[PDB]
């Protein structure tokens, strides 16, 4: 069993580039994430991974913010009835609004589909350490891997990785619990990718020799 | 100004086959080619170079093969330490005591007045880094802080650029913690056949971005 995790980038360079308004880009955003969350069931993942937003990522200003929030709803409210949605994350950056729309979604998903969709809203590795730490301090005589791993953002190790839109960096998105993941990258815009990018993609992820250290 | 550079050597055992020697050959070409690179960040004014030692990991390896490694990169810091500031972190409980004893000594005998500084990470695991954060200010403290965490990390300061050659593109439990900002660089170039025009085109390619 291996599961998936997307890191989407390039709408505004893709709205520039089709002489489109941001908007229309982040709807054109909404279907390829359908279709991306549909090429991943096909694919045997048991997990789909969508990093939806860094802490940093809410200092834009409240109309992109809004626009952002809205069309990665809109993922959800599409495919929300045929598999298991949750989510996690920075939670207390996130408006109110969008917590309560996604809460709804997932207690409306199918909980026993053996598929997830999970977003990560308000990723950042030391936003993630000082919430775990100020949810545990002073209550437990140490901290141990297991409790780690079941308060972590991403709730399991990420095998896959992708990060379209031609950035080699992880930004906040590294997931904590993730040491062997296997990471893609391609200068591919994300509204650009095809099924057989993806494919392509898998290819390269899947001939890799997973040591793991030894 | 600060400025740093991390470096994840990779590929020893590849380059053994492909040369047809020891293991043991193939990480003294690491050594030099550690001096090497040492020598190289300097030159290009990075202020402190980190080196990813080993992974937890790593040290579930063979006896044999762990004496190796750290033995290597213990003679990189046995031939550098006089004229460099040298320092390291990580999970020391793990590192087998004899290499940490040496290793000690000479950090506190390095050159603490260089403007340099190369700095060994050993041990790395992000869970374990947390693990041992928590355990330090668990009840000792009214909330955990940015800056704390920031001065309890194994990397104590934002790494700049990332540098992994050997083919692998994945961070194998060397992921810094505190540097959001890193931009990383993956060739697939082994380390012992890194040459410095390798090592400039990196630098070209992530100080462009
Ligand atoms: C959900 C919220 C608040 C923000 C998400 C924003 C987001 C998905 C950013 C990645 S795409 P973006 O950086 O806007 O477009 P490019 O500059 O990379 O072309
Ligand atoms: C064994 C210890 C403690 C440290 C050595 C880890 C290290 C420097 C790995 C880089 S080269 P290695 O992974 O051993 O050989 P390849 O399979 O990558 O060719
Ligand atoms: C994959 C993803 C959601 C990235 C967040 O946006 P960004 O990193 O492109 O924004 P910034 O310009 O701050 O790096
Ligand atoms: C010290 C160092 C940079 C080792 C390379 O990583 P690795 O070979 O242990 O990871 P993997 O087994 O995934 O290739
Ligand atoms: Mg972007
Ligand atoms: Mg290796």
Redesign the pocket.
Known sequence: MTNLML???GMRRWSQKQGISLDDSYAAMTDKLVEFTGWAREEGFTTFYV????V??YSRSEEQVTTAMNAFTEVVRRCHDTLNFNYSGTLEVVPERWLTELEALRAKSDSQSDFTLHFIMGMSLAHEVIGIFNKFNGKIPALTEELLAANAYVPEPVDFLI?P?G?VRM?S?YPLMSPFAEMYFCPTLLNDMTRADFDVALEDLRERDRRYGL
């Open positions: 890191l989407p980038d990093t939806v937003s860094s940093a990522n990060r839109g950035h930004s998105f």
